[PDB]
């Protein structure tokens, strides 16, 4: 008897000229229970959202690459404690910089676990106030999408970290490092590994670093507004300029922390899989023991809690794949203990809620959103599911 | 439908010339579910691993002697709070040394519990950077295997501890002290007590401080490389020189922390027993209440966690028998809450996992291993068992 | 003659093109010399009354002007700067975790003089705000009027709450600007009337004298993205872009930008021994001079540091560094020795216990060698 | 000068490591200077230091014992 709060949230966002087009699906027990769409592909022509619409998922790439890493751990390729310098010696002899201009040698080696937990000491180009992000931007680590992953890593490896590995948490480019170390450890490319081990088994036929052959007409327009801003830009539906960060048809483009195109249907296949570690037919992608290892809360936060560019993730801890709800009494929106997942910079969002055998995903394209659509849609779904 | 990851790990280790020969068995509900062997007895002749192959188990001696102590506690011989000086007055008036050359009287008495928990303040001959290990080496505590346990204890008793009893944790020679105090308290020899109370009831016919009569041909060769090294020696299969630390046929040789020979089959009998405190026929070796007392997490660690010679045991606490997993979200390899067990210096490893009614043991002979074979095999078994 | 040996070795090792020094005691020269050339390209000798870009040796001059204005009642140490320019109302503070919040204290004149206002500097490595300074071209755009530069700066966050920490900064430029607001006069005119003319410093100013082109020393060094490691110390001419014009009539700043000579700077240094001209005219009373020289900022474990470079045993007063612990010092000095230095390796000191002043003039940006301190040490050892 | 890093004069003193009483070794986070040598704040020890995390290694190396070894060679070992 609960009304469709999901449609209400999405329709209100579209009617208020805040998002061009939105799709969502909530599954329970691996089957759709709520779904919908609102708005259009692009406001310029008001073309309808195509069937199998394609989205730039940005950091919803991270749980996928992290899951691949867990598969490779299970298969014995490396372990959580593996020092990354054993696979790429460019990461030997790291340095650490601080906000007082002091540089010193790193006193701990960066491990696979540090990459998965964002405790390696890396930063991100867009990090406001960061002691090193200016050097990332100078180096065009994120901006230069045409640079091969392997070559970008050589440039990153020469830069200092912003804390000693293992000692702090900061959301970072470490997932890109992870994708690179995966290539070093396996002698295979990360895009090929993702295809064979995850995408093909889950029938995620539209997911990858380049557009599918029939993909151009299905690509959703991205909206929203270098030097990190001191205040948010106005939330206005103007098409976004991506420069050369996110090519549509570059065969060698591959990353760990962003860069995938996907669809609502494909991402739901991945999210549903995370409830069990199995494909719907029962093929095991990751054993229950290693899935538990991956989902267990691993980084706990103090006062201030988990923050990214000072934005809060209230009641969340970090596990090897992304956020995990560890205190409903600290949470800022409806959830259950153990709810996990992640999100992307263009406002795509997903969650998995093992207590309700529930998964949800919201797909839209807005960079620099001032409205937390993902959390609003999660809260709506939670309210609809008893 | 999981593949045999255990055989894969073991075969890869043998094929990579890292270990000469490996045996393993994983039991569930007291019956073998996975087992195998890889490699050879010795690489010099490539003699096949004999049936009932014998291994030097080193500190896998400690859980056995600790279990004996718990049996003696149950039987009223002594208690956890018993001061050891009540049984051997040579341990009266202990002193404590620090890294600043300062020596002072100990402000707490060493108890049975301190010995079982490595909180007594003892160290070990091979401890790098230790304020007292140089004096242990001068005294040849571990090296002089031909010295009677009772006499070695007289030499140890004259040396200072490295902290006040009960105040810190450091992995140590305290299990040897425990074996000695057991002899003082009972008026019996520790090898005889182990034979009567543990080995014979569990039919561990090949376990003891000297080789069985038909044991010489069954003894696995030991490989790998005094002054504690500042960096690991290269991991290379060269036969190890044991000096006079580990005699094969000395009738008075007995210790608490090392020195036992055993077999995969015998050690699995001991490990399976730890699931219940009973023999397979139902004889109670230790009551459920005292078993619970022995297994409950007893020493908890701060930042840095549990470490031995600065090597981590991530997510582990210490109980009266060895390690116990207390945080899967801190663990570095697959496990479940409450998984417990220990390991030896020649890379033998075992675990007990009450959540899965599971036990596992890996037997091999490599001193100074740079590859954590025990944890790799545990992780493989965990991944194979849902 | 340890001073000559140090300077000649520096020249002979191709580390500095040309160096001049003078050390006075009781207002008269006791040691002096020069080594090297004006420019390595033509090997012209160092000219009579050679002109140097003194960079942050501008700061003690502008700070001294502020003390004169305090004495004359224009403002006081506790004056909130927002009372003079409301663009500095409602400041914000940024941290290394991207957190921004309102400042919980007002910036005062004292904060500007002590670098405790929360400002930073464009070239500050690892700074939470220096990227925004560089984007704004605060130092780079020398052609921009001081008054307009301040408007751009005022919109940026501080890096700590005023009064709560120390960080060497652009605050002296803010001070020059606030002096203009408070007096209704230009800082260059004020400096001319109150300091330069009374001390006969006729070659000191923000523009070159009319006959000054042939007297200007060449500036060397590779040292605006802050370097992670020093550039090699090699004598290549420096490109100053538009940061440091020679003939802009409106160019004026508080923290850098002055041209001066060895002789002019020694006149200023000698004056700081007493607050008087050599003739006995008072520029600053003994009481306010004491207030200005007293150690005011004391440092913790790391000591005083600028871009992580140490100033061992030094505390900060209203004009610059002051030696407060000879047993912590890294080079010969005495308790109470004070002074400052500039980015092109110019250096001076005043040592009251010895009635001694010293100045070393050279032009090298990004030096890997502490020429100024080496020369002070040499001079101290020659006493 | 007091602040001179000693590695500028002998590069064998580049990339020093630091050991503790818990067997932990990590890279030194500061360069050894002339002042550190004069003040015994460089982090060196002595062969006869009781309870020291490194003095056993000094004794093994015979730093003080081997007086016949040239100073220059002794330093390479240290």
Phi and psi torsions of A242, nearest 5°: -95, 0
Asked if B124 contacts B133 with a C-beta cutoff of 8 angstroms, the reply is yes
- D24 contacts chain A (CB < 8 A): no
CA distances from C201 to C258, C277, C289, D15 (A): 12, 11, 20, 50
Q: Tell whether B372 lies on the interface with D, counting CB pairs under 8 A.
A: no
Question: What is residue B199's DSSP assignment?
Answer: I
**D21 interface with B at CB cutoff 8 Å:** yes
Distance (Å) from the alpha carbon of A165 to chain D's nearest alpha carbon? 12
The string of DSSP letters for B283-310 reads -BSS-HHHHHHHHS--B---TT-EEETT
Q: How far apart are alpha carbons A70 and A83 in whole angstroms?
A: 16
Put simply, the answer to whether A100 touches C305 (Cβ < 8 Å) is yes
- Which residue's structure tokens are 């606030």? C178
The pair of structure tokens assigned to B145 is 């295997």
Sign of CA dihedral D40, D44, D47, D51: positive
Quickly count helices (H) and strands (E) in chain C. Answer: 10, 14
Those of residues 221-260 in B touching chain D at CB distance below 8 A are: 227-228, 230
What span, in angstroms and rounded, lies between the C-alpha atoms of A73 and B126?
Answer: 32
Name the token pair of C349: 């000191």
- With CA atoms as reference, report the closest residue to B128 among A109, D19, D46, A108: D19
- Cα–Cα distance, C69 to C284 (Å, whole number): 10
**Nearest by CB: C99 against A132, A159, A310:** A310
Nearest to A176 by CA among A257, A249, A248: A257
CB A110 within 8 A of CB A83: yes
Of B2, B329, B376, the CB nearest to A297: B329
Q: How many helices (H) and strands (E) does chain B have?
A: 10, 15
Assess A74–B contact: CB distance below 8 Å, yes or no. Answer: yes
Q: How far, in Å, CA of B9 to CA of B5, rounded? A: 6
Does the distance separating the beta carbons of A108 and D27 come in below 8 Å?
Answer: no
* Nearest by Cα to A70 from A343, A298, A378: A298
For residue C157, give both structure tokens: 């966050």
State how far Cα C377 lies from the chain centre: 20
Contact criterion met (CB below 8 Å) for D28 and D18 = yes
> Could you give phi then psi for residue B112, rounded to 5 degrees?
-50, -45
Q: Among residues A242, A240, A54, which one has the least CA distance to residue A146?
A: A242
What backbone torsions phi and psi does residue C114 show, to the nearest 5 degrees? -100, 5
Is residue B340 within 8 Å of residue B358, measured between CB atoms?
no
A83, with CB counted inside 10 A (0-12, 13-18, 19+), is: middle
Q: Please calculate the CA angle A76-A78-A82 and round it to the nearest 5 degrees.
A: 145
Give the angle A162-A166-A169 at the CA atoms, nearest 5°.
60
C273 alpha carbon, distance to own chain's centre: 18
CA separation for the pair A180, A173 (Å, rounded): 11
Which two tokens mark C326? 């000879």
Comparing CA positions, the residue from B224, B276, B207, B278 lying closest to residue B60 is B207
Query: Is residue D1 a contact partner of residue C2, using CB atoms and an 8 Å limit?
Result: no
d(CA A304, CA C97): 11
Minimum distance, in Å, between the CA of residue B386 and any CA atom of chain A? 5
What one-character DSSP code corresponds to residue C237?
B
Residues 105-124 (A) with a CB less than 8 A from some CB of D: 105-108
Q: Please answer yes or no on whether C135 and A98 come within 8 Å at the CB atom.
A: no
Q: How far apart are CA B303 and CA B294, in angstroms?
A: 25
What is the torsional sign of CA D45, D46, D52, D57? positive
DSSP state for residue B91 in the 8-state scheme: G
Based on the number of CB atoms within 10 Å of its own CB, is A270 exposed (0-12), middle (13-18) or buried (19 or more)?
A: buried
Q: Could you tell me if C28 and C12 are in contact, meaning their C-beta atoms sit under 8 angstroms apart?
A: no
Q: Which residues pair with C20 in a beta bridge?
A: C34, C361
Q: What is the dihedral of CA C199, C203, C207, C212, to 10 degrees?
A: 170
Q: Which of B244, B222, B226 lies closest to B367 in space, CA to CA?
A: B222
Looking up tokens 């039991």 gives B27
Decide if A157 touches C, using CB distance below 8 A. no
Query: Assign residue A336 a region: left if phi > 0, alpha if psi is -120 to 50, beta otherwise?
Result: beta
Distances (CA, A) of B316 to A175, B146, B370: 27, 35, 20
* Chain A: closest CA distance from residue D75 (Å): 23
Residues of C in contact with D3 (CB under 8 A): 310, 312, 330-331, 370
Count how many pairs of residues, chain C against chain D, have C-beta atoms within 8 Å.
14
* Resolution of the structure in the document, Å: 1.7
Q: What is the side-by-side strand order in the sheet with A31-39?
A: A31-39, A21-28, A358-363, A349-353, A340-341, A323-325, A316-318
Q: Which residues of D touch C367 (CB under 8 A)?
A: none
C100 touches A: beta carbon within 8 Å: yes
For residue D65, the tally of other CB atoms under 10 A from its CB is 11
Query: How is A114-136 classified by DSSP, letter by letter?
Result: HHHHT-SS---TT-TT-SSHHHH
Query: Closest Cα of chain D to C106: distance in Å?
Result: 37
Q: If phi over 0 gives left and psi between -120 and 50 gives alpha, with beta otherwise, what is residue B232?
A: beta
Residue contact D1–C310, C-beta within 8 A: no
**Residue in A156, A114, A118, A158 with CA at minimum distance from that of residue A137:** A156
Put simply, whether B383 touches D (Cβ < 8 Å) is no
**Residue B107: strand, helix, or coil:** coil
Cβ contacts of B386 on chain A, cutoff 8 Å: 287-289
Burial code (b: 16+ CB inside 10 Å, e: under 16) for B235-265 equals bebeebeeeebbbeeeeebbbbbbbbbbbbb
Buried b (16+ CB within 10 A) or exposed e, B156-191: bbebbbbbbbbeebbbbbbbbbbbbbbbbbbeebbb
* Residue C306 phi, psi (nearest 5): -130, 120
Domains and their CATH numbers in chain A: 1-386 (3.40.710.10)
b/e map A132-166, b = 16+ CB within 10 Å: bbbbbbebbbbbebebebeebbebbbebbbbbbbb
Q: Is there contact between D and A if contact means ≥3 C-beta pairs under 8 Å?
A: yes
With beta carbons less than 8 A apart as the criterion, state whether A41 and A49 touch: yes
Q: How many residues does chain C have?
A: 383
> Which technique?
X-ray
Say how far apart CA A129 and CA C130 lie, in whole Å: 9
Kindly list the distances between the CA atom of residue C109 and the CA atoms of B105, C63, C129, C317, in Å, as whole numbers in the listed order: 59, 10, 22, 13
Any long-range contacts for B297-303 (C-beta under 8 Å, 24+ apart)? B297/B324, B297/B326, B298/B117, B299/B117, B299/B118, B299/B119, B299/B169, B300/B326, B301/B169
Tokens of C150: 């301040």
Give the Cα separation of B186 and B192 in Å (integer). Answer: 11
- Give the count of beta carbons closer than 10 Å to the beta carbon of residue C97: 17
Report d(CA C44, CA C41) in Å as an integer. Answer: 8
Q: Across the strands, what pairs with A343? A: A349
Q: Are A241 and A21 in contact (CB under 8 A)?
A: no
Give yes or no for C352 touching D (CB within 8 A).
no
CA C156 to chain centre: 23
CB contact under 8 A, A319 and B329: yes
Are the CB atoms for C259 and C203 separated by under 8 Å?
A: yes
Q: Closest by alpha carbon to B220, among B30, B49, B2, B36? A: B49
The shortest CB-CB distance from A80 to any of B1, B9, B332 is to B332
SS3 state of residue C23: strand
The CA distance from D60 to D76, in Å, is 14
Own/partner contacts of A349-352, CB < 8 Å, gap of 24 or more, are: A349/A373, A349/A374, A349/A375, A349/A377, A349/A378, A350/A60, A350/A267, A350/A271, A350/A374, A351/A271, A351/A378, A352/A271, A352/A274, A352/A275
As a whole number of angstroms, the distance between CA B331 and CA B326 comes to: 9
Q: Hey, are the CB atoms on D29 and A107 less than 8 Å from each other?
A: yes
Q: Which chains touch A (3 or more CB pairs under 8 A)?
A: B, C, D
Residues D44, D48, D52: CA angle, nearest 5 degrees: 55
Q: How far apart are the first and last CA of chain A?
A: 10
Q: Does D26 touch chain A (CB under 8 A)?
A: yes
Tell me how close the Cα of A108 comes to any Cα of chain D, in angstroms. 7
Question: What is d(CA B60, CA C292) in angstroms, rounded to the nearest whole number?
Answer: 72
Beta strands in chain C (DSSP E): 18-25, 28-39, 44-45, 52-53, 92-94, 100-102, 259-260, 304-306, 309-311, 314-316, 321-323, 338-339, 347-351, 356-361
CA-based nearest distance D7→chain A, Å: 16
CA distance to B260, C235, C250, C364, C365, per residue, from C240 (Å)? 77, 15, 18, 12, 10
Chain A residues in contact with D29 (beta carbon < 8 A)? 104-105, 107
C-alpha–C-alpha distance, residues C67 and C74, integer Å: 10
Contact A59, A68 (CB under 8 A): no
SS3 A190: helix
Give the residue from B331, B372, B379 with the most A CB atoms within 10 Å of its CB, the best one to mutate: B379
Sign of the four-CA dihedral A141, A143, A144, A149: positive
Question: At B103, is the secondary structure helix, strand, or coil?
Answer: strand
User: Which H, E and C letters describe C165-213, residue by residue?
Assistant: CCCCCCHHHHHHHHHHHHHCCCHHHHHHHHHHCCCCCCCCECCCCCCCH
What residue has token string 């401890």?
B127
How far is it, in rounded angstroms, from Cα A83 to Cα A109?
Answer: 6
Contact C379/C350 with Cβ under 8 angstroms? no
Q: Between A149-157 and A174-186, two packed helices, what is the crossing angle to 10 degrees?
A: 120
Q: What is the DSSP string of A234-284?
A: P----BPP-TTSS-SS-TT---SSS--EEEHHHHHHHHHHTTTTB-TT--B
Is chain C touching chain A, with at least 3 CB–CB pairs below 8 Å? yes
- In the block, tokens 């600790």 appear at B66
Smallest CA–CA separation between A80 and chain B, in Å? 6
Helices assigned H by DSSP within chain B: 5-15, 61-74, 112-117, 133-139, 149-157, 174-186, 190-194, 264-273, 288-295, 373-384
Which residue, B172, B257, B268, is CA-closest to B209?
A: B257
Length of chain B measured in residues? 386
Distance from CA of C99 to the nearest CA of A (A): 5
Return the CA Rg of chain B. Answer: 20
Mutate which: D19, D27, D31, D32, vs A, most A CBs within 10 A: D27
Q: What share of chain D is helix, strand, coil (3-state, %, to 5)?
A: 35, 10, 55
Do C176 and C253 touch, CB atoms closer than 8 A? yes
Q: Does D53 touch chain B (CB under 8 A)?
A: yes
**CB-CB neighbors (< 8 A) of B335 in chain A:** 289, 293
**Residues in Cβ contact with A92 at an 8 Å cutoff, skipping those fewer than 6 apart:** A85
Report residue A326: phi and psi, to 5°.
-115, -5
Task: Identify whether the C-beta of residue A374 lies closer than 8 Å to the C-beta of residue A348.
Answer: yes
Whether the Cβ atoms of residue B373 and residue B13 lie closer than 8 Å to each other: yes
Give D3→chain C minimum CA distance, Å: 6
Q: Name the 3-class secondary structure at C332.
A: coil
Q: Is A284 on the interface with B (CB under 8 A)?
A: yes
DSSP string of C245-299, one letter each residue: -SS-TT---SSS--EE-HHHHHHHHHHTTTTB-TT--BSS-HHHHHHHHS--B--
Instruction: Compute the half-sphere exposure of residue C360: CA atoms within 13 Å on the CB side of its CA.
Output: 31
Contacts of C373 in chain D (CB under 8 A): 1
Identify the chains in contact with D, defined as 3+ C-beta pairs within 8 A. Answer: A, B, C
Looking at residue B240, what DSSP letter applies?
A: P
Residue A155 Cα, gap to closest chain C Cα (Å): 14
Nearest CA in chain D to C311: D3
Among residues B52, B63, B347, the alpha carbon closest in space to that of B217 is found at: B52
Q: How far apart are CA C172 and CA A72, in angstroms?
A: 57
Alpha-helix runs per DSSP H in chain A:
5-15, 61-74, 112-117, 133-139, 149-157, 174-186, 190-194, 264-273, 288-295, 373-384
Q: Could you tell me if residue B259 is left (phi over 0), alpha (psi between -120 and 50 degrees) or otherwise beta?
A: left
Q: What is the DSSP letter of A197?
A: I
Q: B131 to chain D: which residues are within 8 Å by CB?
A: 21, 50-53
Instruction: Output the CA torsion sign for B52, B53, B56, B59.
Output: negative
A interface test, pick of C96, C168, C223, C301 with most A CB neighbours within 10 Å? C96
Unique residue bearing structure tokens 């009483």: D21
Closest alpha carbon to C227 in C95, C362, C368, C118: C368
B225-B230-B232-B238 Cα dihedral, nearest 10 degrees: -20
What are the two backbone dihedrals, phi and then psi, of residue B301, each rounded to the nearest 5 degrees? -115, 155
Burial of C352 (0-12, 13-18, 19+ CB in 10 A): middle
SS3 category, C235: coil
CA B248/CA A320 separation, integer angstroms: 47
Contact D3 C374 (CB under 8 A): no
Q: What distance in Å separates residue D27's CA from the closest CA in chain A?
A: 6
Distance separating alpha carbons of residues B224 and B203, to the nearest angstrom: 32
| Ramachandran sector of residue B11 (left: φ over 0; alpha: ψ -120 to 50; beta: rest) | alpha
């Amino acid at each position: 008897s609960m009304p469709d709060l999901l449609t209400n949230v999405a329709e209100n966002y579209v009617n208020q000229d805040l998002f061009a087009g939105i799709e969502w699906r909530i599954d329970q027990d691996g089957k759709p229970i709520f779904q919908g769409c609102a708005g259009v592909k692009d406001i310029e022509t008001r073309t309808f959202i195509p069937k199998n619409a394609i989205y730039r998922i940005y950091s919803m790439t991270k749980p996928i690459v992290s899951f691949l890493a867990m598969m490779l751990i299970e298969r014995g390729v490396f372990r959580l404690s593996s020092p990354i310098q054993n696979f790429d010696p460019r990461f030997k002899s790291m340095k650490v910089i601080d906000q007082h201009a002091h540089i010193e040698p790193a006193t701990a080696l960066i491990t696979i676990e540090h990459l998965l937990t964002h405790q390696a000491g890396f930063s991100y180009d867009f990090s406001l106030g960061c002691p090193i992000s200016a050097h990332y931007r100078d180096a065009q680590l994120i901006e230069d999408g045409g640079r091969d992953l392997t070559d970008m890593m050589g440039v990153l490896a020469e830069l200092p970290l912003v804390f000693h590995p293992g000692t702090q948490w900061k959301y970072s480019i470490s997932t890109d490092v992870l994708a690179h170390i995966i290539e070093c450890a396996t002698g295979e490319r990360v895009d090929d590994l993702l295809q064979r081990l995850i995408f093909d088994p889950l029938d995620m036929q539209d997911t990858g670093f380049s557009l599918p052959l029939d993909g151009a007409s299905r690509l959703m327009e991205v909206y929203g507004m270098g030097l990190p801003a001191l205040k948010p830009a106005p939330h206005v539906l103007v098409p976004a300029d991506l420069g050369s960060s996110h090519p549509t048809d570059d065969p060698d483009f591959r990353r760990g922390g962003h860069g995938l195109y996907s669809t609502l249907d494909d991402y739901m296949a991945f999210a549903n899989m995370l409830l069990s570690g199995q494909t719907p037919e029962g093929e095991t992608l990751l054993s229950p023991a290693v899935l538990k290892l991956a989902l267990a809360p691993r980084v706990h936060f103090g006062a201030r809690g988990m923050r990214i560019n000072d934005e809060p993730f209230a009641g969340y801890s970090w596990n090897l794949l992304g956020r995990v709800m560890t205190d409903v009494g600290a949470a800022a929106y409806a959830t259950h203990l153990g709810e996990f997942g992640w999100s992307g910079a263009a406002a795509t969002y997903f969650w998995v809620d093992p207590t309700k055998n529930m998964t949800g995903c919201v797909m839209t394209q807005f960079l620099g959103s001032q409205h937390p659509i993902g959390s609003d849609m999660q809260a709506a779904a939670m309210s609809m599911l008893g």
